[PDB]
Amino acid sequence: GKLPPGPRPLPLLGNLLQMDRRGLLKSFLRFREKYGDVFTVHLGPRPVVMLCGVEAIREALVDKAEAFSGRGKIAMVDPFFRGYGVIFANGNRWKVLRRFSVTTMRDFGMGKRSVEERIQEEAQCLIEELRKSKGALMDPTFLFQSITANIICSIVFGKRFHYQDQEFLKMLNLFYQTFSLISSVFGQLFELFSGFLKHFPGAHRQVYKNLQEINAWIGHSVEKHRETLDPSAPRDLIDTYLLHMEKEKSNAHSEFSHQNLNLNTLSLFFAGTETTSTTLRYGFLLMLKYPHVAERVYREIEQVIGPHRPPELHDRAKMPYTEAVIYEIQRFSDLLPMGVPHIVTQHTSFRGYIIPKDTEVFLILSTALHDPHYFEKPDAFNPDHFLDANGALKKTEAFIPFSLGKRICLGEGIARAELFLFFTTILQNFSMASPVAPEDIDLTPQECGVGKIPPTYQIRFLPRH
Ligand code: HEM
Ligand SMILES: CC1=CC[C@@H]2C[C@H]1C2(C)C
After folding, report:
1. What separation in Å is there between the alpha carbon of 191 and the centre of ligand 1?
2. Most exposed: 114, 115, 125, 132, by fewest CB within 10 Å?
3. Where are the Phosphoserine modifications?
């Protein structure tokens, strides 16, 4: 007959005075200690229901999908997206854009040989690039974004960009900076008080500007596509979308609008770049801290693939250890600890509580990923979390870094293909070194809000034999 219980709110400030200084996620984990897995927190002026643990998350996202499949806002980027694009769309717009983005990504490769080939080709470009560096120290963030960006680029814009291209590097810089600012301490505070803080200067202004600058670059590329469009042969997703615009042009309410074009494309480009690159960033940081694991990965590569033939997706079933190491890098690095917010789309009863239409819901994915019933010592990096006694791969229903249900990550198969191919192709050709001894490597994220973002680091890729 009411919302889940939770800390007693003030007017105006919500549960501000009961929050933890270290961030939203910490705040919610202390609430979970007292209230259990289903609780309400007032983030400024509104109630947000928190769902923790795989059972509650799955009960909401899979058994009540008719109710929990709506998308809430992220205060820091809503002023830009405004419900346009597949990530932030709702209702019929999401239905159309979801169907479209999934389907046309497949058209042009996703989950087919074509994208595997694109990934393998891109890994060969990376390797050639790392060879040219001749064991120099770099922060590899730029290359990890470039390779993941070039995969989604080949599908969306019909092309890849060269690693040396400054205009490309500029977009990458903007995705990196924006993800950090969104995840910053200011970005968390903005989630609570955006109604008041938007009137003043701050990072929300910088994120909107960055986004608009990415939007412009995407505008120019859309114009180029418009000029050269061949209706009998679309080259990529922009062309296919442009064809949908025309087919539907007599309907003033068509979802295939120009704002959806720019913002859906931006959504895909952003998500297709920054999620996988950040994961890899933690992977190599993790490798540096646990060189024994890197070594054991390389032994497997030697034995299953050898030193020269390039890794392919068919290699996965025969490399349980590397696959365990990648699962554990995903579990540990916990990209979106609170997922992306949802919002129930009708009155729903959940475990005896009534959750009104339009209440926001955070599914704390992190609580599934750190569940001590599924992972012993969930705070430590340990690939044994994903292996049985025999050394065979052990998958678990608690492994939900892409979430579940109707809004489940639509790039899951791509991201898994990229993580395996890029991780193994790099390790087959190179070992890693850095100036910081493994004992002294700090894994503490540089930001932790919407995104968990690893700290910067230097690394060397040393060629084998
Ligand atoms: C390690 C890599 C990735 C992780 C951990 C990840 C994680 C997630 C999560 C947790 C969600 C939210 C699902 C929900 O709201 O319940 C999401 C949504 C989404 N992701 Fe991924 N993602 C990754 C890679 C990708 C890639 C490579 C792409 C694009 C090719 C992509 C595109 C999207 C899109 C478009 C959505 C919104 C889906 C919708 O709202 O219907 N992601 N992702
Ligand atoms: C799916 C997402 C990946 C990264 C950040 C959070 C969303 C974004 C706002 C595009």
Report:
1. 20
2. 132
3. 101
